[PDB]
Design an enzyme around this catalytic site. Structure first.
Site, PDB file in Angstrom:
ATOM      1  N   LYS A 106       0.858  -1.225   0.000  1.00  0.00           N
ATOM      2  CA  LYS A 106       0.000   0.000   0.000  1.00  0.00           C
ATOM      3  C   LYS A 106       0.880   1.258   0.000  1.00  0.00           C
ATOM      4  O   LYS A 106       0.664   2.149  -0.886  1.00  0.00           O
ATOM      5  CB  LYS A 106      -0.956  -0.032   1.192  1.00  0.00           C
ATOM      6  CG  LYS A 106      -1.879  -1.240   1.275  1.00  0.00           C
ATOM      7  CD  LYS A 106      -2.900  -1.212   2.414  1.00  0.00           C
ATOM      8  CE  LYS A 106      -2.322  -1.325   3.825  1.00  0.00           C
ATOM      9  NZ  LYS A 106      -1.515  -2.571   4.013  1.00  0.00           N
ATOM     10  N   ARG A 117      -8.982   1.236   9.712  1.00  0.00           N
ATOM     11  CA  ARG A 117      -8.371  -0.067  10.055  1.00  0.00           C
ATOM     12  C   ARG A 117      -9.420  -0.924  10.751  1.00  0.00           C
ATOM     13  O   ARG A 117      -9.146  -2.075  11.044  1.00  0.00           O
ATOM     14  CB  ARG A 117      -7.150   0.238  10.923  1.00  0.00           C
ATOM     15  CG  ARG A 117      -6.131  -0.871  11.014  1.00  0.00           C
ATOM     16  CD  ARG A 117      -5.289  -0.964   9.763  1.00  0.00           C
ATOM     17  NE  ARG A 117      -4.039  -1.644  10.088  1.00  0.00           N
ATOM     18  CZ  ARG A 117      -2.834  -1.123   9.915  1.00  0.00           C
ATOM     19  NH1 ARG A 117      -2.682   0.094   9.422  1.00  0.00           N
ATOM     20  NH2 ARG A 117      -1.779  -1.841  10.219  1.00  0.00           N
ATOM     21  N   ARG A 131      12.124  -5.847   4.454  1.00  0.00           N
ATOM     22  CA  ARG A 131      11.694  -4.427   4.427  1.00  0.00           C
ATOM     23  C   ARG A 131      12.751  -3.584   5.148  1.00  0.00           C
ATOM     24  O   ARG A 131      13.230  -3.993   6.204  1.00  0.00           O
ATOM     25  CB  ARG A 131      10.335  -4.148   5.063  1.00  0.00           C
ATOM     26  CG  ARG A 131       9.990  -2.658   5.105  1.00  0.00           C
ATOM     27  CD  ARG A 131       8.491  -2.396   5.131  1.00  0.00           C
ATOM     28  NE  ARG A 131       7.876  -2.850   6.378  1.00  0.00           N
ATOM     29  CZ  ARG A 131       6.572  -2.902   6.607  1.00  0.00           C
ATOM     30  NH1 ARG A 131       5.707  -2.577   5.655  1.00  0.00           N
ATOM     31  NH2 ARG A 131       6.132  -3.341   7.774  1.00  0.00           N
ATOM     32  N   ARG A 177      12.315  -1.552  10.812  1.00  0.00           N
ATOM     33  CA  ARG A 177      11.274  -1.202  11.814  1.00  0.00           C
ATOM     34  C   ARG A 177      11.292  -2.158  13.018  1.00  0.00           C
ATOM     35  O   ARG A 177      11.481  -3.384  12.815  1.00  0.00           O
ATOM     36  CB  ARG A 177       9.909  -1.203  11.134  1.00  0.00           C
ATOM     37  CG  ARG A 177       9.620   0.121  10.455  1.00  0.00           C
ATOM     38  CD  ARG A 177       8.325   0.123   9.686  1.00  0.00           C
ATOM     39  NE  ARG A 177       7.220  -0.583  10.328  1.00  0.00           N
ATOM     40  CZ  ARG A 177       5.997  -0.611   9.822  1.00  0.00           C
ATOM     41  NH1 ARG A 177       5.766   0.067   8.714  1.00  0.00           N
ATOM     42  NH2 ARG A 177       5.023  -1.288  10.409  1.00  0.00           N
ATOM     43  N   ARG A 192       0.255  -9.187  13.710  1.00  0.00           N
ATOM     44  CA  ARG A 192      -0.371  -8.090  12.939  1.00  0.00           C
ATOM     45  C   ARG A 192      -1.335  -8.672  11.911  1.00  0.00           C
ATOM     46  O   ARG A 192      -2.369  -8.032  11.643  1.00  0.00           O
ATOM     47  CB  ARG A 192       0.686  -7.242  12.226  1.00  0.00           C
ATOM     48  CG  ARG A 192       1.195  -6.083  13.053  1.00  0.00           C
ATOM     49  CD  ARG A 192       1.499  -4.896  12.142  1.00  0.00           C
ATOM     50  NE  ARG A 192       2.646  -5.029  11.261  1.00  0.00           N
ATOM     51  CZ  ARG A 192       3.900  -5.228  11.667  1.00  0.00           C
ATOM     52  NH1 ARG A 192       4.140  -5.430  12.947  1.00  0.00           N
ATOM     53  NH2 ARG A 192       4.918  -5.250  10.800  1.00  0.00           N
TER      54      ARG A 192
END
Length: 209
Positions: free
Chosen positions: A13, A84, A119, A152, A163
């Site tokens: 996204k 969300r 990532r 992160r 998550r």
């Protein structure tokens, strides 16, 4: 042009948000970037997110709704990671915040963990990379500032699993929510295959938009 991007953790996204931002001049409203910002700068509206985000949990509806209302006041837009939950979506509809396009990113669960392990981020800008699938032009460096990329805190496999569970419990029902909205003529709904390469997802979004 008001856009919601919907999809599982790691669907791509934010990657596509950057391209839409630098094209249609549409500002990215990333709730995830805003809460990580507010944790670092100890800001009153968000600093409370730290332990919740470390746990792979959702921040309370009311905090992010306030965050989003505030950021919206200061502006088209692209909502990235908001809403969300149904109560977040209802809050936008109760405040008369209508959108023109809802875009669902379809990515199988089995890709997410393995995807997010690669990532790397430039925290100051929120630019994101992937060591294999969307690498920086110079290994380990931000393309614009040349600064060493980081990982992160919440991208550890354990936290990603958690998550993805919370996404299916709390967020996946927004697919039904906005599909009913599109059925009532309140918005356009489109789905993109988030397993395609970055470049192809970008062209798919340009066809839709």
């Amino acid at each position: 042009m008001r856009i919601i991007l919907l999809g599982a953790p790691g669907a791509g996204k934010g990657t596509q948000a950057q391209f839409i931002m630098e094209k249609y001049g549409i500002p990215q409203i990333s709730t995830g970037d805003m809460l990580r910002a507010a944790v670092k700068s100890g800001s009153e509206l968000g600093k409370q997110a730290k332990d919740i985000m470390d746990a792979g949990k959702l921040v309370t509806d009311e905090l992010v709704i306030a965050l989003v209302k505030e950021r919206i006041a200061q502006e088209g837009f692209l909502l990235d990671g908001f809403p969300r939950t149904i109560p977040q979506a209802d809050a936008m509809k109760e405040a008369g915040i209508n959108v023109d396009y809802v875009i669902e990113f379809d990515v199988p669960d089995e890709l997410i963990v393995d995807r997010i392990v690669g990532r790397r981020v430039h925290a100051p800008s929120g630019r994101v990379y992937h060591v294999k699938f969307n690498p920086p032009k110079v290994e380990g460096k931000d393309d614009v500032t040349g600064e060493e990329l980081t990982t992160r805190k919440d991208d550890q496999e354990e936290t990603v699993r958690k998550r993805l569970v919370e996404y299916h419990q709390m967020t996946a029902p927004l697919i039904g929510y906005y599909s009913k909205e599109a059925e009532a003529g309140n918005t356009k709904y489109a789905k993109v295959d988030g397993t395609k390469p970055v470049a192809e997802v970008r062209a798919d979004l340009e066809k839709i938009l």
